[PDB]
Design a protein around this nucleic acid. Structure first.
Lengths: 101, 97, 126, 74, 69, 55, 160
RNA sequence: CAGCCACCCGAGAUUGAGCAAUAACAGGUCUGUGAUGCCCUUAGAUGUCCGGGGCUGCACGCGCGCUACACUGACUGGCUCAGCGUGUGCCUACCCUACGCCGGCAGGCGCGGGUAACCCGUUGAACCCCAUUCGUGAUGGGGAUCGGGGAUUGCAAUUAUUC
RNA sequence: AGGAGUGGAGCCUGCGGCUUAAUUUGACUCAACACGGGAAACCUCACCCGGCCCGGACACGGACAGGAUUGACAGAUUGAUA
């Protein structure tokens, strides 16, 4: 069928956006009807903790923060082209998946 | 250390069949992770490997509530001679090139 | 005098009714314990208290019954036993009484020496 | 802290003592008009136990280890 | 008017199973004096009621200066 | 009778079976996200894990 | 088998931490510097950087296969999907871990601690780094412990 | 001059944090350390085992908040609206919440909506625009102290810790 | 200038005196005392009792190949189901 989605989940914005731009350019090069980069709301996990190992001193809380980002791109194409365009030397540290409707 | 002989025999068997091995630290567990369905409680497993390391044939290695085993040529010869293993079995990673 | 009865129903009359209808006069928590279901930890202790009752000499209190965990009441079969309950080093002597129904036996056990009233210390005035 | 001193009672308790025959003769015996080993011990009817399992015929009860059946004589 | 028993305060009464209502002086305080029954059972609740302390586990370490002058 | 001798209390509320996985310890544990580490090792590994202060 | 993305991310970070801890406890004698992870569709490779490649390899290439089986058996991943490479660092001068281990193993072998610190400072400054500091603290002369510093170049301690 | 004070314009004419230097404290942490040295160790132990055993024990004061003192509001409801986020499991059993009914309450059973901004949820939360009393109060607020009824993970909730 | 309004007056983990077997301590101005990310029956439990395996591998001596633990109901009983 012509209902194919690709999922790129990562933590850094630069590598993920470069990968998304590369994929969208490659899928534009071949005459494909491709949906643009859909930006799922980034989720940041907040962890306020004790700094000192033993409770002593002042109450200083380390606000550790991790933000993760997700992009979804839909496209109507043969799946063989999807596989051939996935292995385009993707960036390390980004998780890419293929989803069927 | 009072544990069935088949337990130690199978421990040696799997150690030789894999060459290397590990020991997990827990007493709330029922048995060993890779020895599940074999009623081999991990307590006797850590007893086994601590006896083996105290015997002076495996160098201890520990990280994050886990023990890593080593393989020495003297240890290989000792295990083969004591278990009467055939002199043709080799460590697992040397198989399949 | 005026004979005390548990909510109008006495020991023999508690025996007459089934336990499920006995729960209504009972209290909760000792109602949920039966309602969910009963299990072990009441087999060997009940056995030995029955034996201490059986082997008792005539018209005398039965032999000591040794416990650590403070039991509860769900049927008066245990009533009429003298129990040493562990407090941490010694055993507390309690004789079961027919006015204790619908209440835990843990309320009749102690773990601490009663406090003392003395004089103020050195570093306590500020 | 001090020494806990778990020595109020029992000056020195040791492990359990078990004494065994050098070669058990109470298991099989003569005097049954048989030239083979004669059966005085009760044979376990359970499949999970067998003729090599000797439920100790003491003054009371049968002691097995896996099923622990009991027979009354009165 | 067939008002259920649980709405009342004397639901599941002591001595006898009672669910009716009787509002009168001189007996209501004796019903309030329900600790004496448990006082005779010398339970932990009974001892705590003897000392006039909050039996529901309230911390009485040094607090509670009211009512003693 | 070994079953009655050891672990006569099934713990479906325990925390030591899944305690800190760096060193065998429970004090200062976080149970979020399956990390199962103490505060000391959590802060000694947050950069390696992927957490970083930004505010 | 699968879990949400936040939990998988923290689990992958935990696995990276475990890997680095085990390696730095094992191969620091071989001038171990660092580790990295690459993930391909249904495959995971882990690469290492260390100064002495021939020493970190060992004999018959046995250590790499042994350690790989160790991590494969440790982390319960599908077997045959883990492979460990053999790479050397760009330079041992601009890497803090490598020089820290060099100072460590100069200290263990028996040598005046300040001679070793001076040597590591000289080695850093001939490597071309813009600056460094090394602090050696503990009991050097006597029973008291005094933290002891060495700085060269310029170092920034604030901001992004 | 470096700048400061006003005005036009402009979204903003000082948004808020994170990091944060010399050199030090005999500050704390040997009860995170499988980072630990040297004395105490080497079984009449200095642990997971029953959890049995306790800071939920009391003659006063210091030490971080809420209810309160009302006609600045308790008070019948008419109501129209949030943000941050953990959320059904390679030993991770513990998950947030709709259809029908029951019961004041703890909950129940059939599939259950949840790999996510699809599910919670157009998060129908706090005050107030009104609806009986109080119309100037020790009470209906202060339920802070003692009775009795229920369920969901609990081998056990007694010193009712939990609703 | 003052504003939530402080300690004020019941009920907080918390500290300090607290007998008892131990109410354990570590941490005394800001830079301790809702701190040890401490709302504890159980993992927060260190401390008071009785059992659990010795987690004893080299030297050297024992029945020196049959040495000795799990063997639900009654009996030896600080568990009778350790």
């Amino acid at each position: 069928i012509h209902r194919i989605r690709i999922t790129l989940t990562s933590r850094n914005v630069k590598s993920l956006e470069k990968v998304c731009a590369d994929l969208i350019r490659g899928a534009k090069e071949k005459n494909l009807k491709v949906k643009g980069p859909v930006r799922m709301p980034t989720k940041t996990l907040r962890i306020t903790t004790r700094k000192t190992p033993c409770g002593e001193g002042s109450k200083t809380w380390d606000r550790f923060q991790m933000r993760i980002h997700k992009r979804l791109i839909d496209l109507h194409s043969p799946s063989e082209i999807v596989k051939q365009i996935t292995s385009i030397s993707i960036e390390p540290g980004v998780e890419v998946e293929v989803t069927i409707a | 250390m009072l544990m069935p002989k088949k337990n130690r025999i199978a421990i040696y068997e799997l150690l030789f069949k894999e060459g290397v091995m590990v020991a997990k630290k827990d007493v709330h567990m029922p048995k060993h992770p890779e020895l599940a369905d074999k009623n081999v409680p991990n307590l006797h497993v850590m007893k086994a490997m601590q006896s083996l390391k105290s015997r002076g044939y495996v160098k201890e290695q520990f990280a994050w509530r886990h023990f890593y085993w080593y393989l020495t040529n003297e240890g290989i010869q000792y295990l083969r001679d004591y278990l009467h293993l055939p002199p043709e079995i080799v460590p697992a990673t040397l198989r399949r090139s | 005098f005026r004979k005390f009865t548990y909510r109008g129903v006495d020991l023999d009359q508690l025996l007459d009714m089934s336990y499920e209808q006995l729960m209504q006069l009972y209290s909760a928590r000792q109602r949920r314990r039966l309602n969910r279901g009963l299990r072990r930890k009441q087999h060997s202790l009940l056995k030995r208290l029955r034996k201490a009752k059986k082997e008792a000499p005539p018209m005398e209190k039965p032999e000591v019954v040794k416990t650590h965990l403070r039991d509860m009441i769900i049927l008066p079969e245990m009533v009429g036993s003298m129990v040493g309950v562990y407090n941490g080093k010694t055993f507390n002597q309690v004789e079961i009484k027919p006015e204790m129904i619908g209440h835990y036996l843990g309320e009749f056990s102690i773990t601490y020496k009663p406090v003392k009233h003395g004089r103020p210390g050195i570093g306590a005035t500020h | 802290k001090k020494r806990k001193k778990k020595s109020y009672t029992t000056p020195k308790k040791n492990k359990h003592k078990r004494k065994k025959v050098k070669l058990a003769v109470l298991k099989y015996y003569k005097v049954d008009e048989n030239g083979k080993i004669s059966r005085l011990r009760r044979e376990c009817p359970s499949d999970e136990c067998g003729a090599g399992v000797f439920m100790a015929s003491h003054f009371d009860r049968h002691y097995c280890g896996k099923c622990c059946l009991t027979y009354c004589f009165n | 008017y067939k008002i259920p028993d649980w709405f009342l305060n004397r639901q599941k009464d002591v001595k006898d199973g009672k669910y009716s209502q009787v509002l009168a002086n001189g007996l209501d305080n004796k019903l309030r004096e329900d600790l004496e029954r448990l006082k005779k059972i010398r339970a932990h609740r009974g001892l705590r009621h003897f000392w006039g302390l909050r039996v529901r586990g309230q911390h009485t370490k040094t607090t509670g200066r009211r009512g003693r002058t | 009778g070994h079953q009655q001798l050891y672990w006569s209390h099934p713990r479906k509320f325990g925390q030591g079976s899944r305690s800190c996985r760096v060193c065998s310890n429970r004090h200062g544990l976080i149970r979020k996200y399956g990390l199962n580490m103490c505060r000391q090792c959590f802060r000694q590994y947050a950069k390696d894990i992927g957490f970083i202060k930004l505010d | 088998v699968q879990i949400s993305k936040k939990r998988k991310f923290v689990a992958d970070g935990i696995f990276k931490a475990e890997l680095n801890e085990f390696l730095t406890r094992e191969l620091a004698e071989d001038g171990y510097s660092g580790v990295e992870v690459r993930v391909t569709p249904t495959r995971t490779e882990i690469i290492i950087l260390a100064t002495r490649t021939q020493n970190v390899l060992g004999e018959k290439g046995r250590r790499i296969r042994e350690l790989t089986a160790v991590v494969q058996k440790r982390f319960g991943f599908p077997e045959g999907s883990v492979e460990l490479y053999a790479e050397k660092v760009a330079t041992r001068g601009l890497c803090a871990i490598a020089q820290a281990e060099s100072l460590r193993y100069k200290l263990l072998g028996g040598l005046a601690v300040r001679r070793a610190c001076y040597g590591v400072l000289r080695f850093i400054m001939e490597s071309g780094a813009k600056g460094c500091e090394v602090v050696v603290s503990g009991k050097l002369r006597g029973q008291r412990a005094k933290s002891m510093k060495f700085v060269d170049g310029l170092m920034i301690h604030s901001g992004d």
